[PDB]
Design an enzyme around this catalytic site. Structure first.
Site, PDB file in Angstrom:
ATOM      1  N   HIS B  92     -50.629  66.737  86.938  1.00  0.00           N
ATOM      2  CA  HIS B  92     -51.626  67.010  85.909  1.00  0.00           C
ATOM      3  C   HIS B  92     -51.753  68.528  85.821  1.00  0.00           C
ATOM      4  CE1 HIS B  92     -53.015  62.828  85.824  1.00  0.00           C
ATOM      5  NE2 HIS B  92     -53.085  62.850  87.144  1.00  0.00           N
ATOM      6  N   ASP B  95     -55.359  72.809  80.097  1.00  0.00           N
ATOM      7  CA  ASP B  95     -55.184  73.747  78.991  1.00  0.00           C
ATOM      8  C   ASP B  95     -56.589  73.971  78.431  1.00  0.00           C
ATOM      9  OD1 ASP B  95     -55.109  74.655  76.309  1.00  0.00           O
ATOM     10  OD2 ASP B  95     -53.241  73.585  75.846  1.00  0.00           O
ATOM     11  N   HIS B  97     -58.715  75.516  75.551  1.00  0.00           N
ATOM     12  CA  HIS B  97     -58.552  76.108  74.228  1.00  0.00           C
ATOM     13  C   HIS B  97     -59.327  77.433  74.135  1.00  0.00           C
ATOM     14  CE1 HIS B  97     -57.339  72.254  71.784  1.00  0.00           C
ATOM     15  NE2 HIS B  97     -56.502  72.541  72.765  1.00  0.00           N
ATOM     16  N   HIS B 132     -58.031  70.207  77.943  1.00  0.00           N
ATOM     17  CA  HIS B 132     -57.376  68.936  78.173  1.00  0.00           C
ATOM     18  C   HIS B 132     -56.101  69.114  78.984  1.00  0.00           C
ATOM     19  CE1 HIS B 132     -54.016  69.618  75.332  1.00  0.00           C
ATOM     20  NE2 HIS B 132     -54.904  70.286  74.614  1.00  0.00           N
ATOM     21  N   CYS B 133     -55.699  68.041  79.646  1.00  0.00           N
ATOM     22  CA  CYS B 133     -54.475  68.031  80.428  1.00  0.00           C
ATOM     23  C   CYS B 133     -53.330  67.954  79.404  1.00  0.00           C
ATOM     24  CB  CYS B 133     -54.464  66.812  81.348  1.00  0.00           C
ATOM     25  SG  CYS B 133     -52.924  66.562  82.241  1.00  0.00           S
ATOM     26  N   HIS B 142     -51.768  61.639  78.542  1.00  0.00           N
ATOM     27  CA  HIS B 142     -52.866  62.034  79.416  1.00  0.00           C
ATOM     28  C   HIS B 142     -54.148  62.246  78.633  1.00  0.00           C
ATOM     29  CE1 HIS B 142     -50.747  63.243  83.332  1.00  0.00           C
ATOM     30  NE2 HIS B 142     -49.884  62.568  82.596  1.00  0.00           N
ATOM     31  N   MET B 147     -58.207  62.346  79.733  1.00  0.00           N
ATOM     32  CA  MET B 147     -58.165  63.600  80.464  1.00  0.00           C
ATOM     33  C   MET B 147     -58.468  64.821  79.587  1.00  0.00           C
ATOM     34  SD  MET B 147     -55.609  64.377  83.600  1.00  0.00           S
ATOM     35  CE  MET B 147     -56.035  65.689  84.768  1.00  0.00           C
ATOM     36  N   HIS B 252     -72.878  62.014  62.880  1.00  0.00           N
ATOM     37  CA  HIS B 252     -74.055  61.856  62.030  1.00  0.00           C
ATOM     38  C   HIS B 252     -75.218  61.393  62.903  1.00  0.00           C
ATOM     39  CE1 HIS B 252     -76.521  60.766  58.554  1.00  0.00           C
ATOM     40  NE2 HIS B 252     -76.815  59.648  59.196  1.00  0.00           N
ATOM     41  N   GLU B 276     -75.805  66.348  56.778  1.00  0.00           N
ATOM     42  CA  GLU B 276     -76.051  64.921  56.955  1.00  0.00           C
ATOM     43  C   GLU B 276     -74.969  64.409  57.904  1.00  0.00           C
ATOM     44  OE1 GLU B 276     -75.100  62.206  53.460  1.00  0.00           O
ATOM     45  OE2 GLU B 276     -74.298  64.014  52.513  1.00  0.00           O
ATOM     46  N   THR B 277     -73.734  64.787  57.628  1.00  0.00           N
ATOM     47  CA  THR B 277     -72.617  64.354  58.459  1.00  0.00           C
ATOM     48  C   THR B 277     -71.636  65.500  58.515  1.00  0.00           C
ATOM     49  OG1 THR B 277     -72.897  62.047  57.824  1.00  0.00           O
ATOM     50  CG2 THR B 277     -70.732  62.665  58.726  1.00  0.00           C
ATOM     51  N   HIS B 303     -69.360  58.744  61.707  1.00  0.00           N
ATOM     52  CA  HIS B 303     -69.692  58.003  60.484  1.00  0.00           C
ATOM     53  C   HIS B 303     -68.607  57.245  59.708  1.00  0.00           C
ATOM     54  CE1 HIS B 303     -72.231  56.577  57.214  1.00  0.00           C
ATOM     55  NE2 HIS B 303     -73.302  57.048  57.830  1.00  0.00           N
TER      56      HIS B 303
HETATM   57  O1  LIG Z   1     -51.347  73.006  72.321  1.00  0.00           O
HETATM   58  N1  LIG Z   1     -51.553  71.609  72.538  1.00  0.00           N
HETATM   59  O2  LIG Z   1     -52.824  71.141  72.956  1.00  0.00           O
HETATM   60  O1  LIG Z   2     -77.091  56.836  58.656  1.00  0.00           O
HETATM   61  N1  LIG Z   2     -76.177  56.340  59.657  1.00  0.00           N
HETATM   62  O2  LIG Z   2     -75.287  55.268  59.335  1.00  0.00           O
HETATM   63 CU   LIG Z   3     -53.196  64.671  83.344  1.00  0.00          CU
HETATM   64 CU   LIG Z   4     -75.379  56.684  57.541  1.00  0.00          CU
HETATM   65 CU   LIG Z   5     -54.741  71.518  72.848  1.00  0.00          CU
END
Ligand SMILES: O=N[O-]
Ligand SMILES: O=N[O-]
Ligand SMILES: [Cu+2]
Ligand SMILES: [Cu+2]
Ligand SMILES: [Cu+2]
Ligand SMILES: O=N[O-]
Ligand SMILES: [Cu+2]
Ligand SMILES: [Cu+2]
Ligand SMILES: [Cu+2]
Lengths: 336, 336, 336
Positions: B92, B95, B97, B132-133, B142, B147, B252, B276-277, B303
């Site tokens: 494992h 990474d 970001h 993330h892995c 993974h 992960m 949401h 809202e969303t 949503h």
């Molecule tokens: O850059 N790949 O997560």
């Molecule tokens: O407003 N949520 O489905």
């Molecule tokens: Cu992993």
């Molecule tokens: Cu809704």
């Molecule tokens: Cu990535």
């Protein structure tokens, strides 16, 4: 402006180059508005898109998938001579999302094999924009057969950040992302067809599942990796234009970021900053500006990692230069 | 900064807590840059994700899905001690970001069972970021085995709105959303395995359909409902961090809104307001700030309601306090 | 405001009109806060969604899919009388994303056949918002059976761009997009059912594929084409409100642009400009403002072109006026 004025503007022909590279241009416009001329021949041809010899009857602007990036400045006119050789079997046209009127020019450029047309439009809005073929009644088939690309309409004064500070790149790459829908037989083997039309019915059935069999950059799995990885050096400023004419994508530069990202691809919309993963909806182009700080290999991918690593949407950047331990360092290397 | 300057910086050991809770930290940085230390043991373990007893072979950072939220401030250094116990079966790595270089640290943290490593990186960009892995050749597997997690790099001066006014939260919750791809047998029953590797081939086939069988919060259907519902009170300001390392989501808060939402998750990009969303693309984290105004149960969901209510992407907030009839009132209760 | 203060406000009863049209309203508010009254009767009814005669047992607010657009101004109160006729067979309710509390009103409006209710809420936030039915345990089924629509909460001073300049539309249209999941028989033909309940189990199975069989505007393939195409003239300013209560969409006006697009649908969030294709996540409404510059037919589509042209998400605009050769011209018409 007046009729005489347009007729008197300088006309300039440009030689296109195949993606991911971009034809010669200047970031800040040189001189006043011009009619920039381009010519592209459409090629229907079989291309191999993966390591298993899978074929697709591509419909390719200028012979490439994606079609080449055309670069002009705001208020220049783009005048395209589009040619459909008699050796092709289908009618084609072109819709520039950057243009105004007649379905982006689609309604004025329907050309049968053996015909050509010349379309001119004023590039009134700055940004990167998708262009794609769109024959009435068979629009998605042509687009997902690879008949799409993008253009960049730079502000006449070049790029700027949200505060108005200039952003000048050292190099630019165009990554066109393509979702393909290749039919399979009952044994799971991809099918091959003699002519493009023979595959129509089978292909539309795959299209309706909304699940591509392949998602690739520059027309094939691994097209932008290995000896074809894009390059840069520590300290270099790179603009990465990315388009997807039919389906959403979410670019991510692994090990890097999008320092300034015009996610909507429009330069009058201030760029988002310090992005990890940006989003470009199907039917649009976006652009990311990054200054490399570390040498090494970077994975540039569509961050639905199944699409990137199982379906093909992964490219590499090979960067030269000095490692910066301030930014990152292995305090203790992998050890029992 | 030089190696010597970094060596002289104060160090602070942080004790991580399980999602959706977040370890103690201060919104506004206390003092200058420091080296914030974290330790996580990787645990390959079976987890039950639904009430039908469906199992997933999780690859969990710190033993949870998602991995815990790590909080630092811009320009602090994050030093992670990552451990892969001899009881695990796979290599494992991690990474970030938020980091710059070597695939977010993935290239410097590949550890086999029985090994550990210590990575240090400078948190130069403010915002919430996915980690993330990503083992070469086994990346999505993974990640979709759970992960992944996220970190938050707060501005040294804490959060602010688009006008520079301070935004200070009373509570913070971290919702990690996970898409799972569980193989089924010919009778539509989910399969079980006694080894992670045993499920690889079958899982890759489901992953390729780009259609998850489950989409859950905090590792399982109902994980953040009932007794594990998140809490707050009328008048309380809450920050909800949400991540999705592989697939898009659209959070949401039912009955409420995202007063300020850093949809891209980056604090130098002004937040959207009165949402809202909102939308978080696969491969990213986002953050929404809301001040509760009504007591009661709130449904926090992805949503696409099929993903929320058929596939599992639904959480609850239980809010205490006085009801506000000005904002909402039942003039006439349901009646014949 | 106190109960007494609200009771003293003027009331205005509004007559709703069927989408894509919008009831009469003033962009700039007339007077101080009002209690704006609406009435909608829910109709469970069979609708045909394609030329083949495919049927859907719709659950329709006001008898239409989408439900009608309700328009109020910020800080007005929206008072909805919702009626569930005894001829219906299911309990229904309504969740206004524009509202604050009780799941958008959902927890206070559960009405069985033969019942009615009156909900009032303060429209505290400006923008376009989705409203949808959401009965506990059957949420997505009601929503993807078409039980959703949108409301627009205009700022009291009308719309403005991101820099304070007034934006006044000449016409407004509401495009509701609906993803349908229609069961098919062994021959691949869509099934018909006597009663709505008979289709439940088969429908949920299709919903779980997350792949709609149809994606349509105004309730049916081609509903906004032909004699029902939307219309405009060169120089006319049009606001296009678009909603999708369950699934993402990416609107594009072919041959045009989104001059100003509140992609998140919220007016206090500056609009993006010069958009080619915008994005509205499932569970939200968005709005685009455009001034037509060229006459002719425009294809307004969800730009995943398979969804537009194979599944039904395509509408047309017929625009009257003079062609602008400066913006676009066919230098050489298709010729040998
Ligand atoms: O850059 N790949 O997560
Ligand atoms: O407003 N949520 O489905
Ligand atoms: Cu992993
Ligand atoms: Cu809704
Ligand atoms: Cu990535
Ligand atoms: O407007 N269709 O690309
Ligand atoms: Cu074509
Ligand atoms: Cu298009
Ligand atoms: Cu209902």
């Amino acid at each position: 402006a007046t009729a005489a004025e347009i007729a008197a503007l300088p006309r300039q022909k440009v030689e296109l180059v195949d993606p991911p590279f971009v034809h010669a241009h200047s970031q800040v416009a040189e001189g006043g508005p011009k009619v920039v001329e381009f010519t592209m021949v459409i090629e229907e041809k079989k291309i191999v898109i993966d390591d298993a010899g899978t074929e697709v009857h591509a419909m390719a602007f200028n012979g490439t998938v994606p079609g080449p990036l055309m670069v002009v400045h705001q208020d220049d006119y783009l005048e395209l001579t589009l040619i459909n050789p008699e050796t092709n079997t289908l009618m084609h046209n072109i819709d520039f999302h950057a243009a105004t009127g007649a379905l982006g020019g689609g309604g004025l450029t329907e050309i049968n094999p053996g015909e050509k047309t010349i379309l001119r439009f004023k590039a009134t809005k700055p940004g990167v924009f998708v262009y794609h073929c769109a024959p009435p009644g068979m629009v998605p088939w042509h687009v997902v057969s690879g008949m799409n690309g993008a253009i960049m309409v730079l502000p006449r004064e070049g790029l700027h950040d949200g505060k108005g500070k200039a952003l000048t790149y050292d190099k630019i790459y165009y990554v066109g992302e393509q979702d393909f829908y290749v039919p399979r037989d009952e044994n799971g083997k991809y099918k091959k067809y003699e002519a493009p039309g023979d595959a129509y019915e089978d292909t539309v059935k795959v299209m309706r599942t909304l699940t591509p069999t392949h998602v690739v950059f520059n027309g094939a799995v691994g097209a932008l990796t290995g000896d074809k990885a894009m390059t840069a050096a520590v300290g270099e400023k790179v603009l990465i234009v990315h388009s997807q004419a039919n389906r959403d994508t979410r670019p991510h530069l692994g090990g890097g970021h999008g320092d300034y990202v015009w996610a909507t691809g429009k330069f009058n919309t201030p760029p988002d900053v310090d992005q990890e993963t940006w989003f470009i909806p199907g039917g649009a182009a976006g652009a990311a500006f990054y200054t490399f700080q570390q040498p090494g290999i970077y994975a540039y991918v569509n961050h639905n990692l199944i699409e990137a690593f199982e379906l093909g949407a992964a490219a590499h950047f090979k960067v030269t230069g000095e490692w910066n331990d301030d930014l990152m360092t292995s305090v203790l290397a992998p050890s029992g």
